[PDB]
Symmetry: D2
Subunit: 315 residues, 4 copies
C-alpha cells in the first residue's frame, strides 16, 4: 500500500511539497495546519493534478493532530518565518528561535503517540536546534530524524558554479557542513565538476579564486537576497526536502548533506550538525565524516557553537 506522508505545516513550503509528491507519485499526502479550512482548500486544488500527472495519490487537508496516525514520513515546516517586528533587511534565522520552540514540543508529543515508527524531516528554523528538540520530545531513534540544510545550501553553490562553467548543474558537486545559517561551512577543497577537482578549472583560468569567493558569499546570503527581492524561499527548500524524502521511500541510498545527531564525528557529540549521510529504507544508514583539516575544523566548531548558543535560549 502507498506510503502516507504527513506535512505538519501547510504554508508555502508545504504547498510545493504536496505538488511535487503528486508529480512523482510518491504517496498519499496529508496537509496539516492549525489554520482552519486553508489546508482543505490547497489539498483540493492539488488533488486535481493527479489527472495531468498520471498519478494516484490522495491529497487531504487536516486540522486534527491524530491524523498523524499511520504516517510513514512526517515533514515539519510548522512555525514562524519572521520575527513579527523585524524588517526584511535584518532577518535572521536566529530570531525565529523564540517563535518556533514550543511548537516542536507539541508536535513531538503527537508523533510519539501516533506514529513512533515514522521517518521525520525537520525544516523549521533554526533547523539544527529545532531538529534536536523534536528528536528529544518525539522519542524516535537517531536514525529516523534529520533536518534540512546541506542539500538546499549546496544546490545554490552547485548552481552558481555551473552557470559560470556552462555545464549541467548536477555535474557540480560540493559540500557545506556544520549548520544551516550564516555560519554554514563552505568547503572549497571538496568541490568537483564532472568528478574533477575544481582546482583544475581554476588552474586553467576557467574560473578564478576571486569569482569563487563572490559565489561563496552569494551562497551564504541567498535567503536574504531572495527576501530583499520577494519573500522567504520556498520552491528550492521544497525540492530539497522531497529529494531527501524520496531517497528514504525508494531506498535510493543517496549521499545527501543533512542535519543529524553527531556522536564523536569532528570531535562533537550530543548535538545535531550538517554532514553527508546516506538515506535509504532504514533511515540514516550511514553518517559520513569528512576528513577535514584543522582550518576547516575550526570553522565547523564555530557553527556548532552557534547551534549550542541558540539551543540554550530555546530552553
Amino acid at each position: 500500500p502507498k506510503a502516507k506522508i504527513v506535512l505538519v505545516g501547510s504554508g508555502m513550503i508545504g504547498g510545493v511539497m504536496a505538488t511535487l509528491i503528486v508529480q512523482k507519485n510518491l504517496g498519499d499526502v496529508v496537509l496539516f495546519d492549525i489554520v482552519k479550512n486553508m489546508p482543505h482548500g490547497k489539498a483540493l486544488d492539488t488533488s486535481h493534478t493527479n489527472v495531468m500527472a498520471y498519478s494516484n495519490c490522495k491529497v487531504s487537508g487536516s486540522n486534527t493532530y491524530d491524523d498523524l496516525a499511520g504516517a510513514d514520513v512526517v515533514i515539519v515546516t510548522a512555525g514562524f518565518t519572521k520575527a513579527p517586528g523585524k524588517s526584511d533587511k535584518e532577518w535572521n534565522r536566529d530570531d525565529l528561535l523564540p517563535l518556533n520552540n514550543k511548537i516542536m514540543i507539541e508536535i513531538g508529543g503527537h508523533i510519539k503517540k501516533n506514529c513512533p515508527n515514522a521517518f521525520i524531516i525537520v525544516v523549521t528554523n533554526p533547523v539544527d536546534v529545532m531538529v534536536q528538540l523534536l528528536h528529544q520530545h518525539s522519542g524516535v531513534p537517531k536514525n529516523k530524524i534529520i533536518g534540512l540544510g546541506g542539500v538546499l545550501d549546496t544546490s545554490r553553490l552547485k548552481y552558481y558554479i555551473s552557470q559560470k562553467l556552462n555545464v549541467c548543474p548536477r555535474d557540480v558537486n560540493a559540500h557545506i557542513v556544520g549548520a544551516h545559517g550564516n555560519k554554514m561551512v563552505l568547503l572549497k577543497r571538496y568541490i568537483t565538476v564532472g568528478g574533477i577537482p575544481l582546482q583544475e578549472f581554476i588552474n586553467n583560468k576557467l574560473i578564478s579564486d576571486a569569482e569563487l569567493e563572490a559565489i561563496f558569499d552569494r551562497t551564504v546570503n541567498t535567503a536574504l537576497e531572495i527576501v530583499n527581492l520577494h519573500a522567504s524561499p520556498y520552491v528550492a527548500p521544497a525540492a530539497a526536502i522531497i529529494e531527501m524524502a524520496e531517497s528514504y521511500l525508494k531506498d535510493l541510498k543517496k549521499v545527501l548533506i543533512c542535519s543529524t545527531l553527531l556522536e564523536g564525528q569532528y570531535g562533537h557529540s550530543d548535538i545535531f550538525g550538517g554532514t553527508p549521510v546516506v538515506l535509504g529504507a532504514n533511515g540514516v544508514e550511514q553518517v559520513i565524516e569528512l576528513q577535514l583539516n584543522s582550518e576547516e575544523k575550526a570553522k565547523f566548531d564555530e557553527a556548532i557553537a552557534e547551534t549550542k548558543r541558540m539551543k540554550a535560549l530555546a530552553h
Copy 2:
C-alpha cells in the same frame, strides 16, 4: 537550442508553471511582471531546483516587455484575480472583465512586435473573451493561440468520478465545452471509464445518476469551493497549462479541450469557445467538433451567448 518560454505574469500560477517547467526540463523560462524585483526573486529560488531535478533550464525574472523577443511559447496570466471590493462569496469571473481588458491589448502589441511566431496560451479571465481580444491585437494566426479551460474543468470531473469508482484518475475521460465559467457545458453522454461508457457503471449501480448530478455541481463550483476554503486556484490551473504547452513543444498531438476560434463548428463563427483540439508542433493541428444533440447544442449556445455578452462590455 532550448525553447524559450515567457510567462507574462509572475503571480501564483506563474510560479507553479516555472517550477513544473524545470521539473520537466521543458525550456528556458522568463518570469515577466510589472511588479518590481518580485519576478527576479522567484526566478532565483526556482533556478536552484535544476540541481534536484537533473535539469538545465535557465530561469530569469523580467520587468521589460522586449524580453518577449525570441519567445517560442508565451503564457498569459497577467491581470486581476478579484474585483477589488467584492467578497469571496460573490466571485465571479465576469467581474474580472473591466479589470483585465486593457492589459490584453498592451500585451498583444508587444507580442506582434517581439515574437509574432510564438505559440500563445491565454489564462486571464474571463478566458474565452480575453483570448479573442489577444488574438485580434497580437495578429497571430488562429492556429497559434488558445485559452485555458477544458483541461482544467475536466480534471475536476475526472478526478471526482475516479474517487468514487476507485480507479486511476487518468482512466476517466470526460468533456466540458462551450466556455470556462458558470455556463460550462458538462456532457454526461461523453464520459468513459477505462474507455467504457459511464452508463454501464450506472446500470451496475457502481455510481448513481444522483451521485453524478452532485459531482457535476461540484465541478462547476470548484473554483468557488476553493476560495471559500483558501484562495484562487493555482496549482491545477498551472498543471493544466503545462500539459498544453508540453503537447506543443514535444509534438505529442494530444487531444485536449481548449478555447479556440470557431469557424462554423456547432453553428458558431467569429468567437472563441471550448472544444477538443489536437495540439502539436504546428499549434492547433485539428479542431474536433463533437456531434452534439439538440439539447446539448442548446447549452453550448447559452455558453457562447455569455461570452458574447461580456465581449461587448469589454469594448
Copy 3:
C-alpha cells in the same frame, strides 16, 4: 524495502523486462532460467544501467528455483516460442501447448512452496490456458494471478488508429477480449479517440469502415507479421507486462485488459478469459464486465471454446 521481482524465464521478453524495471526503478530483479550462466550474463550487463538511469535496483541471475523465496511479483515467460519443426508461415500459439504445459506445473509447485503471497503474471502461450494451469498448481488466490493479453493486443489497435488520425497513441482507447490468440474479440463499438466515439470520426470521413476492417485484420495478425519479418515479438509484450506489474506495485488502479478467472461474467465460469480489470495493491481489485450485445457475446463464446479445447489437450 524494495519489491523483489522474479522473472521466471530470462529469454527475449525477460531481458527487456529487466531493462525496463531498472529504467523505472521498480524493484530488485532476479533473472531465473534453466540455461546455465546466461541469466548471470544478462543480469551483469543490465545492472550497469543503474548508473545511466539514476536508479538503485539489484539485478541478479539465477539457476535455482528457491530464489523465488521472498518474491513480491513473479513473471512467467518460461517455455517454447515455436513448435520445433514448424515453419514461420504456420505459427500458431496453439502448437506451443504440448511444449509448455509441464513447465507450468513445475513452476507452480515452487511458487506454492517459496512465495505463496506473490502476485503472478503469466505470459507463456497459449496464455489463457497456461494461466489457469498455473493458478491451479500454485494455489494462489484468484485475485493474485493474471495473464498477458489485452494490454498487448490493444496497443497495436490503438497505435494503428492513432497513426491514421494523427493523434497521440495513448489518446486512442479500445477493447479486445475473450482470449489472446486468433480468436481475440475486437470490439469496434468500444473504440474512442480522446474519449470520443470512433463512429464520429467515421461519420466525418476522417477514417473509413473499410480502413478499420484492415486495421482489425492487421491487429489479429501482428505477431505473424513480425515473425514473417524478424522474430517472435518481445519489446511490446515486455512493455505491456511492465505496465501491469507497475500498476500493482504502485497501487495505480489502472483499468487494463488481462486474462482473469471468470465467475459468471459473460455467462462463463471456471475458465480464464480476457476482460478489463482494475490492478492495484490488492491485485485484481475489480473485474469489469462489458455489457456486450448478442453478436459480441457470440464471438466471446467462440474465444472461450478455443481456450477450453486446448485446455483439454494439455491434460
Copy 4:
C-alpha cells in the same frame, strides 16, 4: 518538429536504443540495416510501446541509405561483433578491425551526401580507430562526432564500487580515459563518492586498496566476463549511447567521457582518444583535459599507441 534519429545498424544495441528512445520520447527513429526485412520487424514491435510509454515517436525500418536524409543524430553500430573463427575465450576488439573498416568509409560517404549537419556517435569497434575513420570520410566538423567509451567503461567501475559501499550508483564518479579496450586507463586518484575522495573511504577501511585493484581488473575485463557467460554486451552500451544522445538533443551540457579529436591535450594531436567532454546543443562544446601526473600520462600514451597501431592496419 521532432528530432530524426537514424540508427545505422539494427542489431542488439540498435534494438535497445530504439526502445529507450521511445521510453524517453526523444525523437523519431529509423532502424537501418543491410539485412532485409529485419529492421522493419523490430521497428513494428517497438512502435507499439508508444502506447505504454505515453510517447509519440515514429519508429520505422529501412534498407535504404538515403533515408539518412534529414537526420539530426546518427548512431553507428554497423559491423562485426566477433572475428568469424575466434573462440569466446580469445575475443578481443582488435580482431574486429579488418571486419569493420570498409563499412565506415561507405557510411561516411552517405552521411556527407545526406546529412552533413548531423551529430554522429560511433560505436563500432575498435571505436577510437573507427570514429576517426568516419570523421575523415564523412567530412563533419570535429565538434560533431564522438565515439562511445568512457560512459560505458565508468558505469561498470562506478557500479561495482557502489555495491561495496552500499550507496546510490550515480553517487560514485570516476574517470577512465585514453581508449576503449584493454589499454583503458583507470584513474584511481579521480574517484569520488558523493563528491568525496575515495581515499577517505580507504583510510576508514570501508573499502581496501586490494578490493579496488580487483574491481579495476573486473572493470577492464567486463565485456569478456559477459561473453564467457552470455554474449556481446548490449544493454549497458545502449543506455550509455542514449545518455550521450540525450545530452545533445536536450542541451543538457553533461560532462561525459567520450572519444574525441585531440589537438594537443595530454601532448597528443591528430588522433581520437577518450577524455571528459561537455555535450550540448553545439555538439562537443568543451574538451576537458585532466591534469594527469607523469605516471598517468605514461598509461595514456600506451593507450594512444595501441589506437595508432590498429589505425595503420585498417589502412
